[PDB]
Amino acid sequence: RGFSSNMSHSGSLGGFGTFEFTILMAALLNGGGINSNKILLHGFSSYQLFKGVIKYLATMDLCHDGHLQFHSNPASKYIDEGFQTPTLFDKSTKVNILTKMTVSSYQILKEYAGETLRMLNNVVQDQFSNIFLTNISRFDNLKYDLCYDVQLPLGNNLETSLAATFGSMERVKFITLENFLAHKITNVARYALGDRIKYIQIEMVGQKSDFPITKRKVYSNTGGNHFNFDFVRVKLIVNPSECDKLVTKGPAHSETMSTEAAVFKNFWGIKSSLRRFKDGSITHCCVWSTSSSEPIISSIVNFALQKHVSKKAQISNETIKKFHNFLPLPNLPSSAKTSVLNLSSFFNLKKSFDDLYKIIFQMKLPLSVKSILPVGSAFRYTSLCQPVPFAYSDPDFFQDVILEFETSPKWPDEITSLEKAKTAFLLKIQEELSANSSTYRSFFSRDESIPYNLEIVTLNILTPEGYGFKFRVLTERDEILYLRAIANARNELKPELEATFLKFTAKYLASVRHTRTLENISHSYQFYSPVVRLFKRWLDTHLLLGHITDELAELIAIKPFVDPAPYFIPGSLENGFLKVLKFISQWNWKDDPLILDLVKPESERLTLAQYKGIQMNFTNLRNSDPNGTHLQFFVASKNDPSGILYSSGIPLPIATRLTALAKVAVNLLQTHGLNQQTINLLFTPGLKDYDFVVDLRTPIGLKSSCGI
């Protein structure tokens, strides 16, 4: 986790080292409870000793409410009172061992122990490698959602104003300006953002600790013996639920202006003011503007730091901005001002579907409608480009929907008659829809996705609000007829027929389930929709979507969310996307299966019996296919226990590209830090390794008609 015994007030994350780790053991081995009872026993093994402290640190608070006291030279007892700072008092020595431990770092420590305790209690999956054999400290971006570098003025000494702010009183409190200035950034940044963030870290980049024998104090090239740092980097763990809130709520109005209101109005200054709402509450709040290129957090920190820290400070995070721009910008009203977390385009789509939903049901047909199920990408919030009215050049414009009727014994027993009978039902749905609702337009198209089933005809409805929907009919007899074909097929032809059945269930049966879970699972994972869209964009640039089915790109992209360990859940677009690339780089798909628990954050969780069954499946397939030529990616879940449903038919060359490109991208980030040039490389295709390359141009530009 990149935690050390070094000082943390300077800015580096640390303050909890081995001797903090050990002295917590010894303090716990002689007590630790509120009743001064032993929490750890001398007979415990290494596993139990480690588990106790991780549980002890995770749930008991040592900073705000509660502190622990022990006697080195007397049972350790947990006091309810807190000193508002991480404290482990030692009455024998009168020494607080967590003095170097900062408030902000402590919360990240408490979070890390808790999330490991959940993994430690986990019995379904082995977590040894994640707990101990996975370094999260390599990249700051992967650990921390947003990173902002602040360039302080006059950096061969800090400006007179900034030096003046240090003053004599704070030299007593904080011995070095680095200790004070780091504290100054945290308070204003923490107070300015408030609930928008979970954890904040301030790092003095380029700080040295060793200096030659000939010199009395450390010398920084920018510092000039004055300040031992090059620049300050502000790193955050954002809270997706309220990171994009337009207005920062504050204290309520009163006849006498309260102290919390006093600190409220002063901090944001002119940005502070008083507003009313529909509920009738009168509260001091400040209002920001949403943008499609940067989050609200960008504006708050820039204004907050400049007003309080230094008016000359330069605050910049371009890496966020490039990733935001790479996402296609829809051609709707106020698209630029729309946030990346806004699904307004998507809600408009299903409302139009709901209008059609009411129409189809009241319509009289020979067989009553069982249900109409939307199974589309925009219905699951994964379409690369957001839906746009009348933008029919978009590949995802015509959205598939499954129509099922009441079970009947009159369905044709032959495949072609069945499917032709389906078109007859759809042909009615077109007919009196045209008569009753003339504002809706319709036409028929053929589908060839299912091999050897050439009678499939789908009804395309052009909705008046400007959206296209594709309808295909589902019936119980359809599934068993495919099973009949496999049984009747010759032994040599059976592997071909089961492949046809595999694609059928991928569109009709498993497709319905995939939307139902992902659509519900998408909400609490607010940033999953942008990252999977940007992830899909990255595949398209490198000519990989043609072989990767849309659902596989979603299953690979959701892994950092459902399985964030050893990291946290992605809370920013770049952190999630780089996490997806990191996983693909280190994924050994020949010997390691991918299995996901498509569940909400802490039922439908995979149990031990289900877990071992899927593991048994992977071994059996790899026994027949060790090299993985036939199958490369084994992606499974409750929807797909077989694990081959959405990863079949991918050529081995392309499968290696996804890992090969992912590996080089990670290596590129290591060799050169995340910057504008690197990102532009990440999203441009080499196109040279291909044996022959053919260029094409369409007669007209399609960008405008694609809703971009």
Binding site: S45, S46, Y47, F128
Partner: peptide
Amino acid sequence: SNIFKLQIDELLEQVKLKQKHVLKV
């Protein structure tokens, strides 16, 4: 639990210092 316990042991021996350098220092 036995799988974890053996996994603990493998990690200790892999990272365990070579005693020769202890004598050297």
